[PDB]
Amino acid sequence: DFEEIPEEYL
Amino acid sequence: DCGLRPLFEKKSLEDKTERELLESYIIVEGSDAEIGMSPWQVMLFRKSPQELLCGASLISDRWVLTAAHCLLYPPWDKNFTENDLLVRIGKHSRTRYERNIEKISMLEKIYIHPRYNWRENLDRDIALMKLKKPVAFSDYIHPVCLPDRETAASLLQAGYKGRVTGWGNLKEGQPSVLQVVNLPIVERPVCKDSTRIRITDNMFCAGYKPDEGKRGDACEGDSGGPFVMKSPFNNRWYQMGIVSWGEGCDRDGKYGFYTHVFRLKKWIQKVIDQFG
Ligand SMILES: NCc1ccc(Cl)cc1CNC(=O)[C@@H]1CCCN1C(=O)[C@@]1(O)c2ccccc2-c2c[n+]([O-])ccc21
């Protein structure tokens, strides 16, 4: 149930 | 400048419960943390599936401290590599992306204590993580201090209270924001007599006994987080322990066990200067 972080980090 | 919080000590403002700690120097059942209360709090985040892995702490602009079992624990088939995780610093909310506040860092290398004992009692439950790039400090991101021999000797006493923080389970049930709880250090004999697990000098336990009334404990998800104390001598926060293990969460007669940071300081320093 975690939002979603910017793609750069992933 | 470690252990001095931008939103509190730096502005001469006190948080709502630090007084409880000072008076003693003579997460289950906790409460929501105040903004900027634990600027050194770090969230170990798993890339896929995206989820909370453990807590951790910031000790410099490029080093993060956590519990070894958060990264390596054969019984549960846990053996993460640096590319499997991310480090989220400056957070308050557990699940939301705090744009303009938190900073997400990648891991360059993981260092587990050579003598970490995962097969028996989590002895030497400690690990270091070097970030690929230094994180910029701010009102919400700031390193905590590591204790020296004198600090440990003076504050690591039965009855003296420390503070534990984390985004772990609220009951043995996930919190919206970072949770905090102050717990008293418990004398060694009591710790030893509360479990069948062998206790070592590299760990100390904390929590209230049933006759004290008050409650509180770390729980699953809090591992790796810091157990800190505010020195009454220099008004700086020191990380005395690392959330390590416990039988259940907040059970009467049981206590939370924490990795004795000062006892493993030697290892910490060696790793630091050897690898940048
Ligand atoms: N249990 C929640 C809890 C409560 C208080 C604190 Cl301070 C920390 C924690 C979180 N830590 C854990 O759960 C850790 C993760 C590794 C095994 N842990 C234990 O604890 C645990 O009691 C446990 C629980 C379930 C299955 C096996 C074991 C186990 C095996 N050993 O050798 C020591 C301690 C434990």
XYZ file of C-alpha atoms and ligand atoms in Angstrom:
321
model
C 0.000 0.000 0.000
C 2.941 2.327 -0.689
C 2.386 5.281 -3.033
C 5.123 5.086 -5.684
C 8.436 6.880 -5.929
C 9.895 8.736 -8.932
C 11.328 6.443 -11.619
C 14.864 7.841 -11.315
C 15.348 6.098 -7.972
C 14.094 2.708 -9.200
C 27.208 18.784 14.614
C 25.707 15.302 15.130
C 22.747 14.788 17.435
C 21.554 18.389 17.255
C 18.152 18.566 15.571
C 17.429 21.555 13.275
C 13.832 21.878 14.490
C 14.570 21.390 18.181
C 18.034 21.791 19.750
C 19.184 24.152 16.994
C 16.255 26.487 17.753
C 16.188 25.743 21.498
C 12.766 24.087 21.301
C 12.056 20.844 23.162
C 9.865 18.025 21.886
C 6.944 16.825 24.044
C 8.634 13.873 25.763
C 12.378 14.499 25.947
C 11.831 15.730 29.517
C 10.803 12.159 30.452
C 14.248 11.011 29.336
C 16.080 13.697 31.299
C 14.094 12.942 34.467
C 15.163 9.282 34.246
C 18.846 10.224 34.264
C 19.159 10.512 38.055
C 6.072 0.367 17.616
C 3.466 -0.796 20.127
C 1.869 1.668 22.558
C 3.811 4.637 21.218
C 2.632 7.901 19.681
C 2.983 9.895 16.471
C 6.390 11.509 16.131
C 6.612 15.299 15.884
C 7.887 16.743 12.607
C 11.691 16.654 12.613
C 11.842 14.714 15.900
C 14.174 11.943 14.636
C 15.977 13.524 11.634
C 18.376 10.576 11.587
C 15.563 8.050 11.080
C 15.993 6.072 7.876
C 13.597 3.704 6.140
C 15.071 0.666 4.401
C 12.808 0.227 1.388
C 12.566 -2.875 -0.804
C 12.391 -2.100 -4.536
C 10.156 -5.017 -5.546
C 7.698 -5.531 -4.217
C 7.758 -1.958 -2.899
C 7.470 -2.323 0.862
C 8.970 -1.430 4.240
C 11.993 -3.592 4.955
C 13.374 -2.152 8.196
C 14.415 0.959 10.037
C 17.901 2.393 10.116
C 19.771 5.534 11.120
C 21.914 8.231 9.507
C 25.362 8.613 11.090
C 27.107 10.803 8.472
C 26.245 12.121 5.015
C 27.221 8.820 3.404
C 26.786 6.097 6.034
C 23.661 4.397 7.375
C 23.514 2.032 10.354
C 21.062 -0.834 10.677
C 20.607 -4.331 12.106
C 22.428 -7.121 10.278
C 19.328 -9.338 10.324
C 17.510 -6.750 8.211
C 19.821 -7.686 5.331
C 20.888 -11.237 6.167
C 18.697 -13.795 7.906
C 18.828 -17.382 6.516
C 15.933 -18.705 8.621
C 13.499 -16.520 6.649
C 15.473 -16.752 3.380
C 16.552 -13.124 3.600
C 19.832 -12.198 1.885
C 19.474 -8.807 0.202
C 22.079 -7.297 -2.112
C 22.611 -3.545 -2.369
C 20.650 -3.335 -5.641
C 17.566 -4.843 -3.991
C 17.008 -1.898 -1.659
C 16.713 1.870 -1.394
C 17.271 4.201 1.557
C 14.583 6.814 2.285
C 15.763 9.623 4.574
C 13.831 12.487 6.157
C 10.484 10.710 6.195
C 7.510 11.056 8.501
C 4.611 9.396 6.698
C 5.112 5.665 6.246
C 3.612 5.076 2.790
C 3.450 8.414 0.980
C 6.185 9.901 -1.197
C 7.156 13.058 0.696
C 8.139 15.243 -2.249
C 10.533 18.087 -1.372
C 11.164 16.561 2.054
C 12.486 13.014 1.876
C 15.498 11.965 -0.179
C 15.928 8.528 -1.739
C 19.488 7.187 -1.923
C 20.953 4.109 -3.584
C 23.331 1.696 -1.870
C 26.949 1.426 -2.958
C 27.955 -1.312 -0.515
C 26.643 -3.311 2.427
C 28.901 -4.345 5.326
C 27.689 -7.010 7.764
C 29.625 -7.628 10.992
C 31.904 -10.690 10.406
C 30.813 -12.294 13.660
C 27.081 -11.576 13.370
C 25.342 -14.655 14.833
C 22.152 -15.291 12.890
C 21.865 -18.963 13.782
C 21.416 -18.545 17.539
C 20.656 -15.217 19.231
C 21.333 -12.397 16.742
C 24.576 -11.548 18.579
C 26.350 -8.577 16.955
C 23.193 -7.625 15.031
C 24.720 -4.699 13.171
C 25.442 -3.600 9.621
C 26.702 -0.534 7.774
C 25.527 0.736 4.395
C 27.512 3.211 2.316
C 25.384 5.401 0.046
C 26.418 6.085 -3.548
C 26.243 9.847 -3.015
C 26.083 11.983 0.125
C 22.642 13.184 1.165
C 22.092 16.882 1.825
C 21.180 17.706 5.409
C 18.049 19.753 6.083
C 15.447 20.372 8.763
C 14.322 16.759 8.354
C 17.630 15.016 7.647
C 20.463 15.106 10.174
C 22.925 12.574 11.642
C 22.778 11.201 15.158
C 25.948 10.849 17.246
C 27.652 7.564 18.099
C 28.604 7.173 21.781
C 32.148 7.166 23.112
C 33.148 5.039 26.123
C 32.231 7.777 28.622
C 28.808 8.422 27.056
C 27.928 4.732 27.185
C 29.184 4.272 30.745
C 27.192 7.254 31.991
C 23.871 6.647 30.221
C 23.606 2.858 29.800
C 22.127 2.256 33.259
C 19.025 0.431 34.450
C 16.166 2.893 34.783
C 17.625 5.399 32.321
C 15.244 5.889 29.394
C 15.969 5.866 25.695
C 13.776 6.457 22.681
C 12.893 3.982 19.937
C 11.272 4.979 16.653
C 9.958 3.136 13.622
C 7.213 2.432 11.108
C 6.736 -1.169 12.246
C 3.565 -2.909 13.372
C 1.459 -1.231 16.049
C 0.531 -4.633 17.531
C 1.982 -8.155 17.640
C -2.026 -2.608 12.151
C 0.357 -0.319 10.271
C 0.877 3.309 11.383
C 0.220 6.327 9.204
C 3.275 8.145 10.532
C 6.572 7.480 12.297
C 5.960 6.162 15.812
C 7.925 6.933 18.959
C 8.203 5.460 22.439
C 10.491 6.058 25.416
C 11.528 2.934 27.321
C 13.731 2.383 30.383
C 16.884 0.274 30.179
C 16.450 -2.930 32.197
C 19.089 -4.470 34.473
C 20.948 -7.454 33.025
C 19.670 -10.138 35.448
C 16.051 -9.243 34.668
C 16.707 -9.297 30.915
C 18.380 -12.706 31.170
C 15.626 -14.125 33.393
C 12.869 -13.070 30.987
C 13.901 -15.429 28.172
C 15.475 -18.798 27.342
C 17.664 -17.180 24.670
C 21.295 -16.593 25.649
C 22.005 -12.900 26.204
C 25.450 -11.457 25.399
C 27.398 -8.315 26.263
C 26.679 -7.002 22.741
C 23.037 -6.479 23.626
C 20.956 -4.772 26.290
C 17.218 -4.951 26.854
C 14.626 -2.276 27.552
C 10.974 -1.922 28.418
C 8.610 -1.692 31.347
C 7.945 -4.635 33.632
C 4.303 -5.529 34.358
C 4.313 -3.815 37.768
C 5.242 -0.427 36.264
C 1.963 0.048 34.400
C 3.386 1.839 31.358
C 3.878 -0.159 28.156
C 5.719 0.031 24.852
C 8.022 -1.982 22.624
C 9.411 -2.225 19.113
C 7.785 -4.774 16.799
C 8.220 -6.294 13.331
C 9.324 -3.597 10.900
C 11.143 -1.570 13.576
C 14.317 -3.680 13.450
C 17.343 -1.648 12.402
C 15.934 1.515 13.954
C 17.771 3.527 16.609
C 17.434 3.455 20.393
C 18.639 6.961 21.272
C 19.308 8.932 24.442
C 19.818 12.676 24.867
C 22.973 13.398 26.803
C 22.290 15.678 29.775
C 25.954 16.741 29.543
C 26.105 18.182 26.023
C 22.431 18.094 24.975
C 23.143 15.915 21.912
C 21.323 12.745 20.884
C 23.342 9.526 20.866
C 22.403 6.207 19.253
C 23.018 3.690 22.051
C 21.221 0.745 20.495
C 19.779 -0.846 17.369
C 16.330 -2.467 17.447
C 17.234 -6.163 17.274
C 14.832 -8.771 18.648
C 12.038 -9.658 21.017
C 9.658 -12.523 21.749
C 6.390 -11.166 20.416
C 5.672 -7.446 20.866
C 4.972 -5.664 24.150
C 4.267 -8.885 26.061
C 4.161 -8.717 29.848
C 7.399 -10.096 31.263
C 9.260 -9.782 27.965
C 11.607 -7.052 26.777
C 12.977 -5.665 23.546
C 16.631 -6.402 22.884
C 18.965 -3.905 21.301
C 22.400 -4.151 19.740
C 24.944 -2.463 22.039
C 26.334 0.201 19.674
C 29.328 1.278 21.752
C 30.509 -2.324 22.180
C 30.730 -2.619 18.390
C 32.115 0.892 17.840
C 35.548 -0.602 17.120
C 34.123 -2.460 14.114
C 32.165 0.602 12.995
C 35.243 2.862 12.952
C 37.367 0.256 11.149
C 34.828 -0.112 8.343
C 34.398 3.666 8.019
C 38.030 4.689 7.542
C 38.905 1.615 5.477
C 36.193 2.283 2.898
C 36.083 6.059 2.522
N 9.601 -9.725 17.322
C 9.389 -8.289 17.152
C 10.435 -7.459 17.876
C 10.133 -7.056 19.225
C 11.106 -6.200 19.864
C 12.314 -5.821 19.164
Cl 13.515 -4.865 20.035
C 12.603 -6.221 17.806
C 11.624 -7.048 17.178
C 11.851 -7.369 15.728
N 12.908 -8.371 15.499
C 12.549 -9.625 15.159
O 11.381 -10.005 15.136
C 13.687 -10.582 14.796
C 13.824 -10.728 13.276
C 14.771 -11.908 13.354
C 14.157 -12.924 14.295
N 13.589 -11.988 15.300
C 13.088 -12.149 16.558
O 12.832 -11.150 17.227
C 12.824 -13.551 17.212
O 12.278 -13.404 18.486
C 12.011 -14.514 16.391
C 10.659 -14.238 15.903
C 10.043 -15.159 14.939
C 10.847 -16.336 14.525
C 12.215 -16.616 15.007
C 12.822 -15.646 15.979
C 14.132 -15.502 16.632
C 15.353 -16.259 16.641
N 16.391 -15.717 17.444
O 17.574 -16.209 17.355
C 16.379 -14.575 18.274
C 15.173 -13.790 18.243
C 14.112 -14.302 17.398
